[PDB]
Design a protein around this ligand. Structure first.
Ligand code: MG
Ligand code: MG
Ligand code: MN
Ligand code: MN
Ligand code: MN
Ligand code: MN
Length: 243
């Protein structure tokens, strides 16, 4: 397990905190990091994000041992099952119909992490020289950037810049992206909701983390930075020190 801490803030302009997440432990004290961004533009985003977080917590705490070679399959199969359960929960309740959430999560191992991603929450590794975004945003503007219809700078001003193209809960099927990243020579793992990186640039995160300070020091500084940049969203992240 890593030294890790969860940080969240409703922010200024939101009725609810619809982000969710946590740091969970199974029966042999292996660590799972979870972050979910419930959709603000649909009903009941906090129900969706807390549903997925609660399911991952309960499923993981029920396990004895998931070794590294088992982890991609465990994450893929549980995300698909949770997506299925969330979809039908929303379909059975008119006040929840259409709800959904992103999810980024990470199973921690000695020298590596296994990450699953659905949506436009992110995972990064950071060291003194670089910050690498491991995940790829499932967002409509990322689609527009990859098809070369807009530049990445326009994405910050585009009228549909909040639309996401893969989400938990809105269809009975989902296909998460899985990543395996070696941790050697990195200093930090960061999982975050778009409330952070829609407003704080990658080099700003790197500059903050490369200074001395504890995980709690850095996370409070990073939250204050997102707020100083006038984030209009819930802001959530897990910061973990590699080691
Ligand atoms: Mg809402
Ligand atoms: Mg280093
Ligand atoms: Mn949200
Ligand atoms: Mn977004
Ligand atoms: Mn958000
Ligand atoms: Mn530091």
């Amino acid at each position: 397990h890593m030294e890790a801490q969860f940080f969240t803030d409703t922010g200024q302009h939101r009725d609810k905190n619809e982000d969710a997440g946590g740091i969970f432990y199974n029966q042999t004290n292996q660590q799972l990091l979870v972050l979910c961004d419930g959709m603000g533009g649909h009903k009941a985003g906090e129900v969706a994000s807390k549903f997925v977080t609660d399911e991952l917590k309960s499923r993981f705490e029920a396990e004895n041992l998931i070794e590294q070679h088992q982890a991609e399959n465990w994450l893929r199969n549980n995300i698909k099952d949770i997506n299925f359960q969330l979809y039908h929960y929303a379909q059975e309740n008119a006040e929840y119909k259409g709800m959904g959430t992103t999810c980024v999560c990470a199973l921690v191992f000695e020298k590596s992490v296994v990450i699953a991603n659905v949506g436009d929450s992110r995972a990064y590794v950071i060291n003194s020289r670089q910050i690498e975004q491991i995940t790829s945003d499932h967002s409509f503007v990322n689609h527009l950037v990859l098809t070369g219809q807009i530049t990445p700078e326009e994405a910050f001003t585009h009228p549909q810049r909040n639309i996401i193209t893969k989400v938990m809960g809105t269809d009975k099927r989902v296909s998460p992206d899985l990543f395996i990243k070696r941790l050697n020579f990195y200093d930090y793992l960061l999982l975050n909701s778009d409330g952070l990186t829609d407003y704080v640039k990658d080099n700003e995160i790197k500059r903050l983390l490369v200074k001395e300070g504890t995980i709690e020091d850095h996370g409070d500084q990073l939250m204050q930075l997102a707020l100083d940049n006038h984030s209009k969203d819930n802001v959530t992240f897990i910061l973990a020190a590699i080691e």
